[PDB]
Amino acid sequence: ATLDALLAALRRIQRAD
Amino acid sequence: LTEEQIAEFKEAFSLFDKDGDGTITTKELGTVMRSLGQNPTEAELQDMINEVDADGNGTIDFPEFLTMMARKMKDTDSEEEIREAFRVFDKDGNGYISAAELRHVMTNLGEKLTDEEVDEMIREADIDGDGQVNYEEFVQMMTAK
Ligand SMILES: [Ca+2]
Ligand SMILES: [Ca+2]
Ligand SMILES: [Ca+2]
Ligand SMILES: [Ca+2]
Known part of the structure:
Protein backbone atom coordinates (compact mmCIF):
# COMPACT_ATOMS: atom_id res chain seq x y z
CA ALA A 1 0.00 0.00 0.00
CA THR A 2 2.69 2.24 1.26
CA LEU A 3 6.06 0.59 0.74
CA ASP A 4 6.50 1.75 4.33
CA ALA A 5 3.54 -0.26 5.61
CA LEU A 6 4.27 -3.31 3.45
CA LEU A 7 7.92 -3.47 4.56
CA ALA A 8 7.07 -2.80 8.18
CA ALA A 9 4.34 -5.48 8.08
CA LEU A 10 6.67 -8.05 6.47
CA ARG A 11 9.59 -7.12 8.76
CA ARG A 12 7.47 -7.16 11.98
CA ILE A 13 5.44 -10.29 11.06
CA GLN A 14 8.64 -12.35 10.40
CA ARG A 15 10.07 -11.85 13.89
CA ALA A 16 9.42 -15.43 15.22
CA ASP A 17 10.26 -14.51 18.82
CA LEU B 1 -0.82 7.61 15.13
CA SER B 78 21.02 -8.07 11.39
CA GLU B 79 22.11 -6.83 7.95
CA GLU B 80 21.41 -10.43 7.07
CA GLU B 81 17.66 -10.30 7.66
CA ILE B 82 17.64 -6.97 5.71
CA ARG B 83 19.57 -8.45 2.77
CA GLU B 84 17.09 -11.30 2.40
CA ALA B 85 14.29 -8.72 2.57
CA PHE B 86 16.03 -6.55 -0.08
CA ARG B 87 16.47 -9.63 -2.31
CA VAL B 88 12.72 -10.36 -2.44
CA PHE B 89 12.42 -7.00 -4.25
CA ASP B 90 15.63 -6.92 -6.22
CA LYS B 91 14.45 -9.62 -8.62
CA ASP B 92 17.30 -9.40 -11.15
CA GLY B 93 20.06 -9.03 -8.57
CA ASN B 94 21.38 -5.69 -9.86
CA GLY B 95 21.35 -3.76 -6.51
CA TYR B 96 18.43 -1.53 -7.47
CA ILE B 97 14.72 -2.15 -6.99
CA SER B 98 13.02 -0.56 -9.99
CA ALA B 99 9.31 0.37 -10.49
CA ALA B 100 8.84 -2.85 -12.55
CA GLU B 101 10.27 -5.11 -9.78
CA LEU B 102 8.00 -3.57 -7.07
CA ARG B 103 5.04 -3.84 -9.46
CA HIS B 104 5.82 -7.48 -10.02
CA VAL B 105 6.08 -8.08 -6.27
CA MET B 106 2.73 -6.28 -5.68
CA THR B 107 1.04 -8.40 -8.36
CA ASN B 108 2.20 -11.56 -6.64
CA LEU B 109 0.53 -10.23 -3.48
CA GLY B 110 -2.72 -9.96 -5.53
CA GLU B 111 -2.34 -6.22 -5.67
CA LYS B 112 -3.73 -4.34 -8.71
CA LEU B 113 -1.33 -1.37 -9.03
CA THR B 114 -1.16 1.60 -11.42
CA ASP B 115 2.22 3.04 -12.64
CA GLU B 116 1.59 6.26 -10.70
CA GLU B 117 0.86 4.25 -7.55
CA VAL B 118 4.07 2.30 -8.17
CA ASP B 119 6.08 5.47 -8.80
CA GLU B 120 4.80 7.05 -5.58
CA MET B 121 5.81 3.89 -3.83
CA ILE B 122 9.38 4.19 -5.22
CA ARG B 123 9.25 7.89 -4.20
CA GLU B 124 8.87 7.15 -0.43
CA ALA B 125 12.17 5.24 -0.21
CA ASP B 126 14.14 6.82 -3.09
CA ILE B 127 16.44 9.32 -1.46
CA ASP B 128 19.13 10.18 -4.05
CA GLY B 129 16.30 10.62 -6.65
CA ASP B 130 17.39 8.13 -9.30
CA GLY B 131 13.96 6.53 -9.56
CA GLN B 132 15.13 3.32 -7.88
CA VAL B 133 15.80 1.96 -4.42
CA ASN B 134 19.32 0.89 -3.67
CA TYR B 135 20.11 -1.12 -0.56
CA GLU B 136 21.39 1.73 1.54
CA GLU B 137 17.99 3.38 0.73
CA PHE B 138 16.25 0.06 1.40
CA VAL B 139 17.91 -0.13 4.90
CA GLN B 140 16.62 3.27 5.98
CA MET B 141 13.07 2.36 5.10
CA MET B 142 13.50 -0.86 7.04
CA THR B 143 15.68 0.40 9.85
CA ALA B 144 14.53 3.87 10.98
CA LYS B 145 11.87 4.70 13.68
CA1 LIG C 1 -5.92 -13.02 17.98
CA1 LIG D 1 16.73 -4.72 -9.81
CA1 LIG E 1 -8.30 -14.42 6.62
CA1 LIG F 1 17.45 5.92 -5.27
Missing part, protein backbone atom coordinates in the same frame (compact mmCIF):
# COMPACT_ATOMS: atom_id res chain seq x y z
CA THR B 2 -2.79 9.46 12.43
CA GLU B 3 -6.16 8.23 11.11
CA GLU B 4 -4.61 7.81 7.64
CA GLN B 5 -1.72 5.85 9.19
CA ILE B 6 -4.42 3.48 10.43
CA ALA B 7 -6.07 3.23 7.02
CA GLU B 8 -2.62 2.46 5.53
CA PHE B 9 -2.11 -0.28 8.07
CA LYS B 10 -5.60 -1.52 7.21
CA GLU B 11 -4.51 -1.79 3.56
CA ALA B 12 -1.49 -3.92 4.57
CA PHE B 13 -3.77 -6.15 6.59
CA SER B 14 -5.79 -6.78 3.46
CA LEU B 15 -2.64 -8.25 1.85
CA PHE B 16 -2.36 -10.96 4.51
CA ASP B 17 -6.09 -11.53 5.23
CA LYS B 18 -6.63 -13.09 1.79
CA ASP B 19 -10.22 -14.31 2.44
CA GLY B 20 -11.09 -10.94 4.03
CA ASP B 21 -12.53 -12.63 7.18
CA GLY B 22 -10.82 -10.16 9.54
CA THR B 23 -8.06 -12.52 10.72
CA ILE B 24 -4.72 -13.63 9.27
CA THR B 25 -4.14 -17.39 9.65
CA THR B 26 -0.86 -19.33 9.46
CA LYS B 27 -2.18 -20.58 6.14
CA GLU B 28 -2.49 -16.99 4.74
CA LEU B 29 0.85 -15.84 6.05
CA GLY B 30 2.22 -19.03 4.47
CA THR B 31 0.78 -18.00 1.09
CA VAL B 32 2.08 -14.43 1.44
CA MET B 33 5.61 -15.70 2.36
CA ARG B 34 5.62 -18.12 -0.59
CA SER B 35 4.37 -15.38 -2.94
CA LEU B 36 7.62 -13.57 -2.00
CA GLY B 37 9.86 -16.62 -2.84
CA GLN B 38 10.18 -17.56 0.84
CA ASN B 39 9.46 -20.90 2.40
CA PRO B 40 8.52 -21.08 6.11
CA THR B 41 7.69 -24.44 7.78
CA GLU B 42 4.36 -24.79 9.56
CA ALA B 43 5.90 -24.31 12.98
CA GLU B 44 7.72 -21.19 11.78
CA LEU B 45 4.35 -19.85 10.65
CA GLN B 46 2.96 -20.62 14.12
CA ASP B 47 5.87 -18.73 15.80
CA MET B 48 5.20 -15.58 13.73
CA ILE B 49 1.40 -15.61 14.44
CA ASN B 50 1.85 -16.21 18.20
CA GLU B 51 4.20 -13.25 18.69
CA VAL B 52 1.38 -10.99 17.40
CA ASP B 53 -1.66 -12.98 18.46
CA ALA B 54 -1.99 -11.19 21.86
CA ASP B 55 -5.22 -12.95 22.85
CA GLY B 56 -4.08 -16.55 22.04
CA ASN B 57 -6.93 -17.65 19.72
CA GLY B 58 -4.55 -18.71 16.88
CA THR B 59 -4.96 -15.80 14.48
CA ILE B 60 -4.14 -12.10 14.00
CA ASP B 61 -7.09 -9.73 13.92
CA PHE B 62 -6.82 -6.11 12.90
CA PRO B 63 -6.53 -4.76 16.48
CA GLU B 64 -3.49 -7.08 16.93
CA PHE B 65 -2.06 -6.09 13.50
CA LEU B 66 -2.52 -2.40 14.32
CA THR B 67 -0.58 -2.95 17.57
CA MET B 68 2.32 -4.68 15.80
CA MET B 69 2.53 -1.89 13.24
CA ALA B 70 2.10 0.98 15.76
CA ARG B 71 4.38 -0.21 18.52
CA LYS B 72 8.06 -1.12 18.46
CA MET B 73 11.01 0.60 20.13
CA LYS B 74 14.20 1.02 18.01
CA ASP B 75 15.95 -2.41 18.11
CA THR B 76 16.26 -4.03 14.70
CA ASP B 77 17.73 -6.67 12.37
Whole structure:
Protein backbone atom coordinates (compact mmCIF):
# COMPACT_ATOMS: atom_id res chain seq x y z
CA ALA A 1 0.00 0.00 0.00
CA THR A 2 2.69 2.24 1.26
CA LEU A 3 6.06 0.59 0.74
CA ASP A 4 6.50 1.75 4.33
CA ALA A 5 3.54 -0.26 5.61
CA LEU A 6 4.27 -3.31 3.45
CA LEU A 7 7.92 -3.47 4.56
CA ALA A 8 7.07 -2.80 8.18
CA ALA A 9 4.34 -5.48 8.08
CA LEU A 10 6.67 -8.05 6.47
CA ARG A 11 9.59 -7.12 8.76
CA ARG A 12 7.47 -7.16 11.98
CA ILE A 13 5.44 -10.29 11.06
CA GLN A 14 8.64 -12.35 10.40
CA ARG A 15 10.07 -11.85 13.89
CA ALA A 16 9.42 -15.43 15.22
CA ASP A 17 10.26 -14.51 18.82
CA LEU B 1 -0.82 7.61 15.13
CA THR B 2 -2.79 9.46 12.43
CA GLU B 3 -6.16 8.23 11.11
CA GLU B 4 -4.61 7.81 7.64
CA GLN B 5 -1.72 5.85 9.19
CA ILE B 6 -4.42 3.48 10.43
CA ALA B 7 -6.07 3.23 7.02
CA GLU B 8 -2.62 2.46 5.53
CA PHE B 9 -2.11 -0.28 8.07
CA LYS B 10 -5.60 -1.52 7.21
CA GLU B 11 -4.51 -1.79 3.56
CA ALA B 12 -1.49 -3.92 4.57
CA PHE B 13 -3.77 -6.15 6.59
CA SER B 14 -5.79 -6.78 3.46
CA LEU B 15 -2.64 -8.25 1.85
CA PHE B 16 -2.36 -10.96 4.51
CA ASP B 17 -6.09 -11.53 5.23
CA LYS B 18 -6.63 -13.09 1.79
CA ASP B 19 -10.22 -14.31 2.44
CA GLY B 20 -11.09 -10.94 4.03
CA ASP B 21 -12.53 -12.63 7.18
CA GLY B 22 -10.82 -10.16 9.54
CA THR B 23 -8.06 -12.52 10.72
CA ILE B 24 -4.72 -13.63 9.27
CA THR B 25 -4.14 -17.39 9.65
CA THR B 26 -0.86 -19.33 9.46
CA LYS B 27 -2.18 -20.58 6.14
CA GLU B 28 -2.49 -16.99 4.74
CA LEU B 29 0.85 -15.84 6.05
CA GLY B 30 2.22 -19.03 4.47
CA THR B 31 0.78 -18.00 1.09
CA VAL B 32 2.08 -14.43 1.44
CA MET B 33 5.61 -15.70 2.36
CA ARG B 34 5.62 -18.12 -0.59
CA SER B 35 4.37 -15.38 -2.94
CA LEU B 36 7.62 -13.57 -2.00
CA GLY B 37 9.86 -16.62 -2.84
CA GLN B 38 10.18 -17.56 0.84
CA ASN B 39 9.46 -20.90 2.40
CA PRO B 40 8.52 -21.08 6.11
CA THR B 41 7.69 -24.44 7.78
CA GLU B 42 4.36 -24.79 9.56
CA ALA B 43 5.90 -24.31 12.98
CA GLU B 44 7.72 -21.19 11.78
CA LEU B 45 4.35 -19.85 10.65
CA GLN B 46 2.96 -20.62 14.12
CA ASP B 47 5.87 -18.73 15.80
CA MET B 48 5.20 -15.58 13.73
CA ILE B 49 1.40 -15.61 14.44
CA ASN B 50 1.85 -16.21 18.20
CA GLU B 51 4.20 -13.25 18.69
CA VAL B 52 1.38 -10.99 17.40
CA ASP B 53 -1.66 -12.98 18.46
CA ALA B 54 -1.99 -11.19 21.86
CA ASP B 55 -5.22 -12.95 22.85
CA GLY B 56 -4.08 -16.55 22.04
CA ASN B 57 -6.93 -17.65 19.72
CA GLY B 58 -4.55 -18.71 16.88
CA THR B 59 -4.96 -15.80 14.48
CA ILE B 60 -4.14 -12.10 14.00
CA ASP B 61 -7.09 -9.73 13.92
CA PHE B 62 -6.82 -6.11 12.90
CA PRO B 63 -6.53 -4.76 16.48
CA GLU B 64 -3.49 -7.08 16.93
CA PHE B 65 -2.06 -6.09 13.50
CA LEU B 66 -2.52 -2.40 14.32
CA THR B 67 -0.58 -2.95 17.57
CA MET B 68 2.32 -4.68 15.80
CA MET B 69 2.53 -1.89 13.24
CA ALA B 70 2.10 0.98 15.76
CA ARG B 71 4.38 -0.21 18.52
CA LYS B 72 8.06 -1.12 18.46
CA MET B 73 11.01 0.60 20.13
CA LYS B 74 14.20 1.02 18.01
CA ASP B 75 15.95 -2.41 18.11
CA THR B 76 16.26 -4.03 14.70
CA ASP B 77 17.73 -6.67 12.37
CA SER B 78 21.02 -8.07 11.39
CA GLU B 79 22.11 -6.83 7.95
CA GLU B 80 21.41 -10.43 7.07
CA GLU B 81 17.66 -10.30 7.66
CA ILE B 82 17.64 -6.97 5.71
CA ARG B 83 19.57 -8.45 2.77
CA GLU B 84 17.09 -11.30 2.40
CA ALA B 85 14.29 -8.72 2.57
CA PHE B 86 16.03 -6.55 -0.08
CA ARG B 87 16.47 -9.63 -2.31
CA VAL B 88 12.72 -10.36 -2.44
CA PHE B 89 12.42 -7.00 -4.25
CA ASP B 90 15.63 -6.92 -6.22
CA LYS B 91 14.45 -9.62 -8.62
CA ASP B 92 17.30 -9.40 -11.15
CA GLY B 93 20.06 -9.03 -8.57
CA ASN B 94 21.38 -5.69 -9.86
CA GLY B 95 21.35 -3.76 -6.51
CA TYR B 96 18.43 -1.53 -7.47
CA ILE B 97 14.72 -2.15 -6.99
CA SER B 98 13.02 -0.56 -9.99
CA ALA B 99 9.31 0.37 -10.49
CA ALA B 100 8.84 -2.85 -12.55
CA GLU B 101 10.27 -5.11 -9.78
CA LEU B 102 8.00 -3.57 -7.07
CA ARG B 103 5.04 -3.84 -9.46
CA HIS B 104 5.82 -7.48 -10.02
CA VAL B 105 6.08 -8.08 -6.27
CA MET B 106 2.73 -6.28 -5.68
CA THR B 107 1.04 -8.40 -8.36
CA ASN B 108 2.20 -11.56 -6.64
CA LEU B 109 0.53 -10.23 -3.48
CA GLY B 110 -2.72 -9.96 -5.53
CA GLU B 111 -2.34 -6.22 -5.67
CA LYS B 112 -3.73 -4.34 -8.71
CA LEU B 113 -1.33 -1.37 -9.03
CA THR B 114 -1.16 1.60 -11.42
CA ASP B 115 2.22 3.04 -12.64
CA GLU B 116 1.59 6.26 -10.70
CA GLU B 117 0.86 4.25 -7.55
CA VAL B 118 4.07 2.30 -8.17
CA ASP B 119 6.08 5.47 -8.80
CA GLU B 120 4.80 7.05 -5.58
CA MET B 121 5.81 3.89 -3.83
CA ILE B 122 9.38 4.19 -5.22
CA ARG B 123 9.25 7.89 -4.20
CA GLU B 124 8.87 7.15 -0.43
CA ALA B 125 12.17 5.24 -0.21
CA ASP B 126 14.14 6.82 -3.09
CA ILE B 127 16.44 9.32 -1.46
CA ASP B 128 19.13 10.18 -4.05
CA GLY B 129 16.30 10.62 -6.65
CA ASP B 130 17.39 8.13 -9.30
CA GLY B 131 13.96 6.53 -9.56
CA GLN B 132 15.13 3.32 -7.88
CA VAL B 133 15.80 1.96 -4.42
CA ASN B 134 19.32 0.89 -3.67
CA TYR B 135 20.11 -1.12 -0.56
CA GLU B 136 21.39 1.73 1.54
CA GLU B 137 17.99 3.38 0.73
CA PHE B 138 16.25 0.06 1.40
CA VAL B 139 17.91 -0.13 4.90
CA GLN B 140 16.62 3.27 5.98
CA MET B 141 13.07 2.36 5.10
CA MET B 142 13.50 -0.86 7.04
CA THR B 143 15.68 0.40 9.85
CA ALA B 144 14.53 3.87 10.98
CA LYS B 145 11.87 4.70 13.68
CA1 LIG C 1 -8.30 -14.42 6.62
CA1 LIG D 1 -5.92 -13.02 17.98
CA1 LIG E 1 16.73 -4.72 -9.81
CA1 LIG F 1 17.45 5.92 -5.27
